[PDB]
């Protein structure tokens, strides 16, 4: 729908784009009015470049609740530290209440393999394509809250380098063996190398092994999806 309205003195929030997500008709009895036809909505507003944020606006109306949720989102703008608008920093394996989030870092032109709500959230944030295994139950509100918590809890590259000190060594397969540093410390430099302890204790997921070994098989494994 249309963008949010500006503020009293200004704050041209028209740049952001609104996108209603879910709609629910709640019937709650009362002392005399009976089943109150209350409606609860969760809207997410944000054009991109990190500027975004969800909100809630329950009421017994439609446009009123929509504009209330829009104003709440305008007053609740979340920011997510990003690295090159295309993919998230690293993977996240969270367990928000009862909704699991298993994300995988993928390159450009890979495709959006995630929930349609997650697809819209990424389109509003700026992320182009990124794989994500929507494990656990499918609760819109809890899933969105967990996704926001995970996006807010992320270790960037510059901060990690400044904390540890060592540079970011990488051997990209697309390019040649020429290593290109992505981040450098802001002062000191740990001359000693990391404790290269082989066979570490990285609790990987069974889905990762099934995908690496191609053992996953079903009637809906990796089938062709719609366009756009």
């Amino acid at each position: 729908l249309g963008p949010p309205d500006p503020g009293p003195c200004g704050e041209t929030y028209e740049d952001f784009d609104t996108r209603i997500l879910e709609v629910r008709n709640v019937f709650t009895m009362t002392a005399k009015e009976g089943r109150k036809k209350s409606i609860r909505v969760l809207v997410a507003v944000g054009n991109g470049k990190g500027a975004a944020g969800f909100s809630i606006g329950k009421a017994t109306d439609r446009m009123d609740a929509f504009r209330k949720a829009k104003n709440r989102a305008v007053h609740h703008l979340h920011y997510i530290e990003r690295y090159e608008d295309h993919t998230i920093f690293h993977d996240i394996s969270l367990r928000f209440k009862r909704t699991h989030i298993k994300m995988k870092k993928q390159p450009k032109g890979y495709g959006l393999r995630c929930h349609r709500a997650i697809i819209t959230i990424c389109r509003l944030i700026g992320i182009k394509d990124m794989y994500a295994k929507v494990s656990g139950s499918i609760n819109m509100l809890s899933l969105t809250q967990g996704l926001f918590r995970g996006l807010s809890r992320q270790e960037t590259h510059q901060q990690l380098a400044d904390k540890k000190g060592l540079h970011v060594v990488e051997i990209r397969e697309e390019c040649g063996p020429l290593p290109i540093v992505v981040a450098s410390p802001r002062g000191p430099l740990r001359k000693d190398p990391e404790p290269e302890d082989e066979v570490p204790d990285v609790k990987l997921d069974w889905e990762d092994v099934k995908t690496a070994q191609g053992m996953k098989r079903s009637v809906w494994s990796n089938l062709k999806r719609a366009a756009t």
């Binding site: 003195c9 470049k49 990190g50 500027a51 007053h75 703008l77 979340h78 807010s152």
Partner: protein, 126 residues
């Protein structure tokens, strides 16, 4: 008009990213002041947890060499033998005078506790 995210972390980085993206069109005047003299600990939200298992606090009980002397004094004799003031700094009461006379005799004496305690008592009686 801005955001009200309190249970996320620190407001410094929030304002920084809001000004970078373009939300906060008008730079807050306190930004430069906070940057010139930052605090010792960033105001990051922390849920007030509780010490369940064997987790203890780092704070301990402070003790000085005069604590044992004052304890022995209060054990031997009765309560304070003087209307303590405590209004002026480093007030010299009967207990404080005894502690001072002790520190003058023990340490700096190297003999025994009973003899020096009796000497301090006699000096106080004098």
């Amino acid at each position: 008009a801005g955001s009200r995210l309190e249970t996320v972390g620190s407001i410094f980085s929030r304002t920084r990213d809001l000004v970078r993206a373009g939300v906060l069109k008008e730079k807050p005047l306190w930004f430069d002041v906070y940057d010139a003299f930052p605090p010792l600990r960033e105001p990051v939200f922390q849920r007030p947890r509780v010490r369940y298992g064997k987790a203890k606090a780092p704070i301990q009980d402070i003790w000085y060499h005069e604590d044992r002397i004052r304890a022995k004094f209060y054990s031997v004799y009765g309560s304070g033998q003087r209307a303590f003031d405590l209004f002026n700094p480093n007030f010299k009461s009967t207990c404080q005078r005894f502690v001072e006379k002790y520190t003058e005799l023990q340490k700096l004496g190297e003999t025994d506790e009973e003899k020096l305690f009796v000497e301090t008592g006699k000096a106080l009686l004098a």
